[PDB]
């Protein structure tokens, strides 16, 4: 939101002129410095003003402040006089001297929120919409809940917020992990600083894997007091001393063991066992930890406090009708297109409550209809979550070929507003552009709300003004109406009712089955997994059925989060249903799984009918009590600010988070400004010096990164890929532009941890501006789920879901995998065997050279395992046919795919890449490698993995379903998701799906 320090200028010269408007009408040109802080300016202005008329009228310098106009078109009152001139984001270089008005602290805090969320906060104050002003005010109590809840047992509760325990969701480690424990124990090293030089000492310990951190602190002080001839009570006296005076930290990053989870449930040590590596811990003084937790207040803002008959829906003994008056700003070629018309449908989620209706057709040059559309539905029969979906459509005619219809623009309306009042009176909403690739005349998944962009097609409607304001019934009457209509066991039945539960969320549910569920709807609460199916069976255009349904959900048994998330997707808009889904999460979704599925849970906020809902308050509540998920909660929201459909909803949501996330807002702002500098340099490299050579670009890069204002911004801040990684000094030595056309930046920092050498001494990340990364995010996330499922079943298939994060429109970060090469790179480290044909064994030989000795078997195992993992995954997801340059392998032997966005784009034949080179490795360089016993058990790993995912096929279909409203073109309709049903073969039994995958594997080795 700021391409440079001034409008159209990247950097200010070392000295520039500034026009200074005094409270007298005199104008003073002040030569100042690009960095000159505002205190330096205000002083040297009031010192030069004595050379200009009417100095007599000016009060003292200290009684005035500057105001100016930002590049965001905000008239910003610069209360924070400590800022540099060049950091203001000034539109034009001028300053208007005024007396400060309003709470200083508040205004300074809002400027800092505005930079964080990427838009001026004062744009919210001007919003007419009362839903917005009610949202802003009425979620401030979810913030007070969280601040008070975390400032409760200070400073521990304040530490538990900033450094929450990074735990697996269960201490039950599956057996293949425990088999790497020495008779049920673990060996661990605890490190300590000796301060005169920050020398260091270490203490190795063997302990039960299920020791709590304080018990670990016990076994260490117990090992150092071995020879101290202490009594059993003197030992207790210093064990108690250290249990409460120190805590344990992971060497190399900011992870702490502040809560008494069993040691092996902390993720860092769950993997040190899985990977057989030594858990390196640092003993640290608790008073040093709480020192870096500066107390942070939360102050209620201004809008929080002040502001300057009806009848029930169910009395309305009339059908529904809606007037379409006219359109505006319709961009259509008056002669290629014959006529236009407005199409409408009344939708509850995605099911038409009644058949669609259109205006009559009308010429392009006069888009006016003044037509009342009548609908085959009762106004009492409207469900609360009913929605009007409409679009303007064009037609082109022919006899030798069919008549063609196309949507021009679309818009959706909530028939009931957030005060559950039914709309009335004439209304006008600007329409949205039809998304690329959509050809359905309507778009019922798009967000409800008028397009804020100007000169966009503006359509006007009128909803009947019934003689008073109309509200939706209160729950009281709804239930007693179920008692009205209800007055108006089994075997095979129950067998099939539970045989319905097995079927996936997208399975064909034929009419006979849905009204069979509606019949046995009361016997369903015995198999609560069935709840989603029974809801799609409710005839929502019947108030009789919907009422009876609210009663069943009010008493429904809590299903587990992996199932409760489906009821937050787009096919379940009813506020009672979604409320039940949220209650399941806030009582069964761990902060871990919340962090895992955070992408989807943020995404389904788009489907929420209103700003203030039970879901957002749950996510915001958790986001403010756990700064790990709060971090990505912020960035995932911030990453979609540019999309004006949600910029408001997300913006109001970010405003709240930033106003209550405490001292972390300061850290986030340093991340944002660091990204801003990176995006403004890549924009310069891509827009200005795109034509320059690749060594000319390299010199602008290193020289620009030489500038002090840049390094002071790009050194010393937290990695948005994982805030636990601190990013210290840059290694310009290692930074570079890259060979891709968008020329991403390879950025490499030193790791400043006192014990950085015990993890990674320098950390490097790729910054790419111009590529849509959120396919990589979702793919890498999904890969992390599949690795998590396999591990818990005991399948030690090692994937590499490297860190990927989108921070905006086609821009984000990608974790570099150290000591890794592509398969194309590795063929190039070999030689040509056949006639202009790379040597197939080259992969095997390079792996031998990198794994001499007893470690050779380990690398082959790792490759054959990770290979099996990515083979199964890429087929399921249709990621199968990858180029050698998109498959990578570490010196370690771990194989993994990359650049998933590059594949989906290249799209617009082989089930998965199981090339010969891999078979050389898997079989250890044998002949007829497809007939050995390494391959015999390799394809036994692939098989067990495929059905292990199909056994969880419901979770994935739900995760993707939740992403439909994201705007990813790969996810525009449930038809898109139908591919995973084909690869998982969900309309076939287990053995048929097995034989299906087996035939794909015989075809995957290109013959067999």
């Amino acid at each position: 939101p700021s391409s440079g320090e001034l409008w159209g200028i990247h950097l200010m010269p070392p000295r520039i002129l500034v026009e200074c408007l005094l409270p007298n009408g005199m104008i003073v040109t002040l030569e100042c410095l690009r960095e000159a802080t505002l205190i330096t300016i205000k002083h040297e202005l009031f010192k030069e003003a004595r050379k200009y008329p009417l100095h007599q009228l000016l009060q003292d310098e200290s009684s005035y402040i500057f105001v100016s106009v930002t590049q965001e078109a905000e008239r910003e009152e610069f209360f924070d006089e400590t800022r540099r001139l060049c950091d203001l984001r000034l539109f034009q270089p001028f300053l208007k001297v005024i007396e400060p008005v309003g709470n200083r602290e508040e205004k300074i805090l809002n400027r800092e929120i505005g930079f964080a969320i990427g838009m001026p906060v004062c744009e919210f104050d001007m919003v007419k919409d009362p839903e917005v002003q009610d949202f802003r005010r009425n979620i401030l109590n979810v913030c007070k809940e969280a601040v008070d809840l975390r400032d409760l047992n200070s400073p521990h509760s304040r530490a538990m917020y900033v450094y929450p325990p990074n735990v697996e969701s269960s201490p039950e480690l599956p057996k293949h992990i425990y088999n790497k424990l020495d008779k049920g124990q673990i060996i661990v090293v605890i490190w300590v600083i000796v301060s005169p030089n920050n020398d260091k000492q270490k203490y190795t310990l063997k302990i039960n894997h299920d020791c709590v951190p304080e018990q670990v602190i016990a076994e260490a002080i117990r090992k150092k007091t071995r020879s101290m001839l202490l009594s059993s009570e003197q030992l207790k006296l210093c064990v108690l001393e250290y249990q409460g005076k120190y805590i344990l930290k992971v060497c190399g990053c900011d992870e702490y063991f502040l809560e008494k989870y069993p040691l092996s449930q902390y993720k860092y040590i769950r993997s040190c066992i899985m990977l057989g590596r030594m858990p390196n811990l640092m003993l640290m003084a608790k008073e040093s930890l709480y020192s870096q937790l500066p107390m942070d207040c939360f102050t209620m803002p201004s809008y929080s406090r002040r502001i300057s008959s009806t009848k029930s829906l169910w009395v309305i003994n009339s059908a529904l009708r809606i007037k379409i008056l006219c359109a505006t700003y319709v961009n259509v070629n008056i002669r290629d297109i014959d006529k236009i018309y407005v199409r409408t449908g009344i939708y509850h989620g995605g099911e038409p409550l009644c058949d669609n209706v259109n205006t009559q057709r009308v010429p392009c040059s006069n888009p006016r209809w003044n037509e009342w559309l009548n609908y085959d539905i009762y106004i009492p029969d409207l469900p609360r979550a009913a929605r009007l979906c409409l679009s303007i459509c064009s037609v082109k005619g022919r006899k030798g070929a069919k008549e063609e219809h196309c949507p021009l623009a679309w818009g959706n309306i909530n028939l009931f507003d957030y005060t559950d009042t039914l709309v009335s009176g004439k209304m006008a909403l600007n329409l949205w552009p039809v998304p690329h690739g959509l050809e359905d005349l309507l778009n019922p998944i798009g967000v409800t709300g008028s397009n804020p962009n100007k000169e966009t097609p503006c359509l006007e409607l009128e909803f009947d003004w019934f003689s008073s304001v109309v509200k939706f019934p209160d729950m009281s009457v709804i239930e007693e109406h179920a008692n009205w209509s209800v007055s108006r066991l089994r075997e095979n039945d129950k067998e099939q009712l539970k045989a319905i539960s097995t079927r996936d969320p997208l399975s064909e549910i034929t009419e006979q089955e849905k009204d069979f569920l509606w019949s046995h709807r009361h016997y369903c609460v015995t198999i609560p997994e069935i709840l989603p199916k029974l809801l799609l069976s409710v005839k929502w255009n019947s108030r009789d059925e919907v009422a009876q349904m609210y009663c069943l959900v009010k008493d429904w048994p809590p299903i587990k989060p992996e199932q409760a998330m489906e009821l937050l997707d787009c096919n379940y808009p009813d506020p009672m249903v979604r409320g039940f889904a949220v209650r399941c999460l806030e009582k069964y979704l761990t902060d871990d799984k919340l962090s895992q599925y955070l992408i989807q849970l943020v995404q389904v906020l788009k489907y929420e009918q209103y700003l203030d809902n039970l879901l957002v308050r749950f996510l915001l509540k958790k986001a403010l009590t756990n700064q790990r998920i709060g971090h990505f909660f912020f960035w995932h929201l911030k990453s979609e600010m540019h999309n004006k459909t949600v910029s408001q909803r997300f913006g109001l949501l970010l405003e709240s988070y930033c106003r209550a996330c405490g001292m972390y807002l300061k850290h986030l702002n340093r991340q944002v400004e660091a990204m801003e500098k990176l995006i403004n340099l890549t924009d310069i490299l891509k827009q200005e010096k795109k034509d320059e050579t690749q060594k000319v670009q390299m010199k602008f890069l290193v020289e620009q990164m030489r500038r002090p204002d840049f390094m002071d911004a790009l050194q010393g801040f937290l990695s948005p890929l994982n805030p636990a990684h601190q990013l210290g000094n840059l290694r310009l030595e290692e930074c570079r532009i890259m060979s891709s056309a968008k020329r991403p930046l390879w950025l490499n920092w030193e790791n400043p941890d006192i014990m950085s050498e015990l993890l990674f001494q320098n950390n490097e990340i790729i910054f790419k501006n111009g590529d849509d990364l959120r396919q990589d995010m979702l793919t890498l996330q999904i890969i992390r789920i599949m690795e998590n499922i396999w591990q818990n079943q005991g399948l030690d298939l090692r994937m590499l879901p490297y860190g990927c994060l989108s921070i905006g429109d086609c821009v984000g970060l990608i974790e570099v995998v150290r000591n890794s090469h592509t398969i194309m790179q590795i063929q190039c480290k070999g030689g040509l065997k056949g006639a202009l044909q790379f040597n197939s064994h080259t992969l095997h030989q390079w792996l031998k050279d990198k794994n001499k000795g007893e470690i050779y078997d380990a690398a082959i195992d790792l490759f054959t395992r990770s290979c099996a993992g990515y083979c199964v995954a890429t087929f399921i997801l249709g990621i199968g046919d990858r180029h050698n340059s998109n498959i990578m392998v570490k010196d370690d032997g771990q194989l993994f795919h990359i650049d998933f966005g590059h594949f989906l784009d290249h799209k617009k034949r082989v089930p998965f890449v199981l090339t010969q080179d891999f078979l050389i490795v898997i079989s250890k360089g044998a002949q007829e490698c497809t007939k050995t016993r390494e391959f015999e058990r390799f394809q036994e790993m692939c098989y067990k993995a495929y059905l292990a995912i199909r056994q969880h096929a419901n979770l994935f279909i739900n995760l993707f379903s939740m992403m439909l409203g994201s705007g990813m073109p790969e996810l525009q309709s449930f038809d898109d998701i139908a591919y995973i049903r084909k690869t998982l073969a969900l309309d076939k039994t287990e053995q048929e799906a097995l034989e299906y995958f087996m035939k794909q594997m015989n075809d995957a080795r290109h013959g067999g």
């Binding site: 409008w7 026009e19 408007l21 007298n24 009408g25 005199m26 104008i27 200009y52 008329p53 009417l54 009228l57 106009v69 930002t70 590049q71 965001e72 078109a73 905000e74 008239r75 539109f91 034009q92 001028f94 208007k96 700003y329 961009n331 259509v332 070629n333 297109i337 449908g345 099911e351 038409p352 009644c354 058949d355 669609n356 085959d376 064009s394 037609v395 082109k396 022919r398 070929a401 069919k402 063609e404 219809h405 196309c406 021009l408 050809e439 005349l441 962009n453 100007k454 000169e455 064909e508 549910i509 034929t510 009419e511 006979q512 089955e513 009204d515 038809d975 139908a978 309309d987 076939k988």
Partner: protein
């Protein structure tokens, strides 16, 4: 009077494909498949009713057919045509329509020499990927122009707040300098009147510069906002044509389907 030879039986078709064929059709349009179970003798009937595509399973037992437990009809065609004469309200009042308008496998076309594929399909497909490249290009500079517009729309609103600040400077220059000019006038201090004017004239000299820079942007906006609306009506003119000849390319595979094997599409691969 045989099933495989009917109009409305397509058989081995995906649910997504029948959704695409019933899209926005009127109530009573219908189509039959074999169930997505791919199971022999087990079938699925989709019909349009109430804006929704509604799925009816057709049972099979002792050679008889139906779609509920009491199972009557000899074949599926006797079952379907019975509900083409009268309503399936007989089955359930909740859907009161007849199986009115079938969608036929054939009854859709566009001398059938092999050139109709090898020449006129490759022709329609080449004509389809060109107009699809143009529309992708249009939608590229459509979104480009859309962003360069809002960039300008905010910048002129910045100019609006800047000009507001300078105009109130003028109206406070005249406020707090009137009665000093009026006092200097009678002290014969023209030297001090011209300092106030030399600064006032320099104030409204710069405000004239930013006013001119504002309009010079409102002009680039006006002319880009128009070339934007043109890109919109060009897309809207290209969308229907693009669909029209995408379908033509698709159903010209029918005579590849009458040949019964996609040999000649793979000749077009390689």
């Amino acid at each position: 009077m045989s099933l495989q030879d009917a109009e409305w039986y397509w058989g081995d078709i995906s649910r997504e494909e029948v959704n695409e064929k019933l899209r926005d059709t009127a109530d009573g349009t219908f189509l039959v498949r074999d169930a997505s179970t791919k199971m022999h003798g087990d079938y699925t009937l989709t019909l349009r009713k109430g804006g929704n595509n509604k799925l009816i399973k057709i049972f099979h037992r002792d050679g008889k057919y139906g779609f509920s437990d009491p199972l009557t009809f000899s074949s599926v065609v006797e079952l379907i045509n019975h509900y083409r004469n009268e309503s399936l309200a007989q089955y359930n009042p909740k859907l009161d329509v007849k199986l009115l308008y079938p969608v036929s496998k054939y009854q859709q076309d566009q001398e059938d020499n092999i050139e109709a594929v090898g020449k006129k399909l490759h022709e329609y497909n080449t004509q389809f990927q060109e107009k699809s490249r143009e529309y992708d290009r249009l939608y590229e500079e459509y979104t480009r122009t859309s962003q360069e517009i809002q960039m300008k729309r905010t910048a002129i609103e910045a100019f609006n707040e800047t000009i507001k600040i300078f105009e109130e400077q003028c109206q406070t220059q005249e406020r707090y300098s009137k009665e000093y000019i009026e006092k200097f006038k009678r002290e014969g201090n023209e030297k001090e009147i011209q300092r106030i004017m030399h600064n006032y004239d320099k104030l409204k000299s710069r405000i004239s510069e930013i006013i001119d820079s504002r309009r010079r942007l409102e002009e680039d906006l006006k002319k880009q906002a128009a070339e934007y609306r043109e890109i919109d009506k060009r897309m809207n003119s290209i969308k229907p044509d693009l669909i029209q000849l995408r379908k033509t390319r698709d159903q010209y595979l029918m005579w590849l389907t009458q040949k019964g094997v996609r040999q000649k599409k793979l000749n077009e691969w390689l």
